[PDB]
Design a protein around this ligand. Sequence first.
Ligand SMILES: [K+]
Length: 335
Amino acid sequence: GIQGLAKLIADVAPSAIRENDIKSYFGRKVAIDASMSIYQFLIAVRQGGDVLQNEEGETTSHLMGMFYRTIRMMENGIKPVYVFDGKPPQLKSGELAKRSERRAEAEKQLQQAQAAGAEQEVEKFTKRLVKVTKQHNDECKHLLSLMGIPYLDAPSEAEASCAALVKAGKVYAAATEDMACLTFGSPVLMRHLTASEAKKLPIQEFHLSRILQELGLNQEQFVDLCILLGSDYCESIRGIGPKRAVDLIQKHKSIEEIVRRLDPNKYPVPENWLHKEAHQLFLEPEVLDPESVELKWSEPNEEELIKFMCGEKQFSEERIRSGVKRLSKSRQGST
DNA sequence: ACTCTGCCTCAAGACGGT
DNA sequence: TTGAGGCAGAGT
DNA sequence: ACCGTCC
Ligand SMILES: [K+]
């Protein structure tokens, strides 16, 4: 994430966002952040406050979500490649650790809810306690393998590896809600791509070059701006938000300069501010080699699919086999 | 009055059958 | 996790 | 569209 970046671009660079109907992404490949979508499902796919599961106790909401949305996308001519998060950059420790503490917090607030009724709390805190695990990951990779859908492991940050794939032309765009993908230099970002039957929000397409033009910056100044707005990798200056940050970056072009010209009594900066290191992470992140693996959208293995989902995970053979045929079908073509 | 902060709420997908 | 949106209040 | 259920 980059705090407020979406609203900012809407506000001061509206020409950088197009809204298109899904019909116009027909025949395009997109890169998807696996870990974020798995998360979205673990949160949303709930039956009675609880997550879907086979009786052995193993979770399955993520498998549901992934299987079906993937199929939908494929039907609409959208070939998705899933990129899985690698090892988090050191600069991320801070953010990550906060995320642990809050979870611990939630967990305590779980007990005091359970021992006092009102499942409103129980389910709220339970949602706040959601966490993607290496198991979730391994399972989804298996599923995608048996669906013929290609997946890649990012050495570190998935978003950075997505931006790398779009840069290299291996895909048209990155489909994610994480504005940071632009910071890492991805020329095109697509929010709200679900290929879902109930629509909801219109697909949003962000062009990086348009953002740059409309804001009057180059990529480097744009990274600095995102750092000021609020990145996952270092702190921000208290009291400088979107409006002020745009002003300052437009006037002084860099963080060093900005820090020289700032009144240290009105706007004091953070102590031991790793902003230069963050910046360098954004310009030169560790990413996979987009030329190593040639992405192929294979044919589903229907039998093995039934064995895995239906067999191991108690999925209705009819719903599954139906999905498998919609997908095998969409491979040869169609609507 | 503009801006930011921080504390809060609240919600989070897809399908099949009407 | 991400919003959007709500509000009080401090600080300009 | 609504909504009961998917597991
Ligand atoms: K800030």
